[PDB]
Write an enzyme that holds these catalytic residues in place. Structure first.
Site, PDB file in Angstrom:
ATOM      1  N   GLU A  11       0.769  -1.243   0.000  1.00 25.48           N
ATOM      2  CA  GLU A  11       0.000   0.000   0.000  1.00 25.48           C
ATOM      3  C   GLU A  11       0.810   1.309   0.000  1.00 25.48           C
ATOM      4  O   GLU A  11       0.320   2.347  -0.413  1.00 25.48           O
ATOM      5  CB  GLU A  11      -0.916  -0.007   1.253  1.00 25.48           C
ATOM      6  CG  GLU A  11      -1.830  -1.231   1.208  1.00 25.48           C
ATOM      7  CD  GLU A  11      -2.946  -1.108   0.194  1.00 25.48           C
ATOM      8  OE1 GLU A  11      -3.022   0.057  -0.381  1.00 25.48           O
ATOM      9  OE2 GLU A  11      -3.718  -1.996  -0.048  1.00 25.48           O
ATOM     10  N   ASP A  20      -6.478   6.314  -5.120  1.00 24.80           N
ATOM     11  CA  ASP A  20      -5.961   4.963  -5.258  1.00 24.80           C
ATOM     12  C   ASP A  20      -5.984   4.539  -6.716  1.00 24.80           C
ATOM     13  O   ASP A  20      -6.289   5.298  -7.602  1.00 24.80           O
ATOM     14  CB  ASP A  20      -6.588   3.957  -4.288  1.00 24.80           C
ATOM     15  CG  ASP A  20      -8.028   3.483  -4.604  1.00 24.80           C
ATOM     16  OD1 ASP A  20      -8.532   3.916  -5.688  1.00 24.80           O
ATOM     17  OD2 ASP A  20      -8.656   2.738  -3.915  1.00 24.80           O
ATOM     18  N   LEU A  32      -9.059   3.679   2.624  1.00 24.20           N
ATOM     19  CA  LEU A  32     -10.049   4.278   1.747  1.00 24.20           C
ATOM     20  C   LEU A  32     -10.873   5.349   2.463  1.00 24.20           C
ATOM     21  O   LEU A  32     -11.347   5.190   3.596  1.00 24.20           O
ATOM     22  CB  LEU A  32     -10.916   3.183   1.139  1.00 24.20           C
ATOM     23  CG  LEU A  32     -12.055   3.749   0.292  1.00 24.20           C
ATOM     24  CD1 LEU A  32     -11.512   4.230  -1.051  1.00 24.20           C
ATOM     25  CD2 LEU A  32     -13.078   2.649   0.046  1.00 24.20           C
TER      26      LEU A  32
END
Ligand SMILES: [Cl-]
Ligand SMILES: [Cl-]
Length: 162
Positions: A11, A20, A32
């Site tokens: 990530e 993203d 998120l």
């Protein structure tokens, strides 16, 4: 290698709101924020998540706090899911990390949907599960990360991350 280090490699870390791979508003370590197109809506979720006016910027500690919450929630969603729980229980520690990574990236519902692969993992048919997991939008959209996860289920080692 452990789950935290594994996801931190997959990530990355960004201290400012970013978009993203699917175009959604994210922050920190793959956290998120909103699926909405609104940056303001994103700033809003962000301040609510942190407990202060952030103006779209957070510190390292705050990023790490969100990350720990999200890993905790991922595990707990797996333990509470009728479909996921049996798979997880049947797996060794390395492979459990691989299922947690998928859940963190695609959510519980998403993962619960890989019916065939899940049954194969349960049966410990490694090569077969790796071939079936690859036939997915997931592998097509994020192939390098997918290959890493997939290698982890195939082999049972952290090789792909070392
Ligand atoms: Cl949150
Ligand atoms: Cl990728």
């Amino acid at each position: 290698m452990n789950i935290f280090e594994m996801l931190r490699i997959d990530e990355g870390l960004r201290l400012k709101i970013y978009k993203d791979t699917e175009g959604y508003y994210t922050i920190g370590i793959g956290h998120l924020l909103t699926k909405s197109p609104s940056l303001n809506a994103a700033k809003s979720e962000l301040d609510k998540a942190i407990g202060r006016n952030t103006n779209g910027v957070i510190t390292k500690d705050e990023a790490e706090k969100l990350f720990n919450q999200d890993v905790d929630a991922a595990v707990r969603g797996i333990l509470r899911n009728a479909k996921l729980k049996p798979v997880y229980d049947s797996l060794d520690s390395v492979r459990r990390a691989a299922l947690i990574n998928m859940v963190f990236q695609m959510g519980e519902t998403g993962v619960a949907g890989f019916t065939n692969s899940l049954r194969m993992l349960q049966q410990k048919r490694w090569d077969e599960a790796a071939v079936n997991l690859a036939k997915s939008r997931w592998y097509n959209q994020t192939p390098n990360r997918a290959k890493r996860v997939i290698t982890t289920f195939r082999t049972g080692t952290w090789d792909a991350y070392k």
